[PDB]
Amino acid sequence: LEELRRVLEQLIVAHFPMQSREFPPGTPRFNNYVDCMKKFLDALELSQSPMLLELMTEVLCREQQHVMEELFQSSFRRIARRGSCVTQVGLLESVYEMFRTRQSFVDR
Amino acid sequence: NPAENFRVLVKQKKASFE
Numbered sequence: 258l259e260e261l262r263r264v265l266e267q268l269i270v271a272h273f274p275m276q277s278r279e280f281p282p283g284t285p286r287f288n289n290y291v292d293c294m295k296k297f298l299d300a301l302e303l304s305q306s307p308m309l310l311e312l313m314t315e316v317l318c319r320e321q322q323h324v325m326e327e328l329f330q331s332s333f334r335r336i337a338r339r340g341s342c343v344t345q346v347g348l349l350e351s352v353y354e355m356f357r358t359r360q361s362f363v364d365r
Numbered sequence: 366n367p368a369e370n371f372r373v374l375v376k377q378k379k380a381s382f383e
Binding site: 271272274275279 | 366367368
């Protein structure tokens, strides 16, 4: 069950090294980037799986509003409405534990 | 990914490329 996040890391590393705007907006690279970030956001929104939540959070929590964080917060809303309370608490504990800039993780 | 960018950059215009 750990192979999932292994390959997640091994793939997403080859996409967003530093920013999302390092590849110019409105360009094929940027366009595919917005496509894939939407794909993860929705698939996870349905899934409500933690590890994906963190991964997309820290990659989001590098540059302020570079990966369309309105979708990010909306995904939080549609997740926190769904799911069992214990599942939500598990996600919250995981994203709390990932806390240990470094600040911006929880902040956003 | 921009690793390849500068790798091809420094030998596509043959400059030290600070």
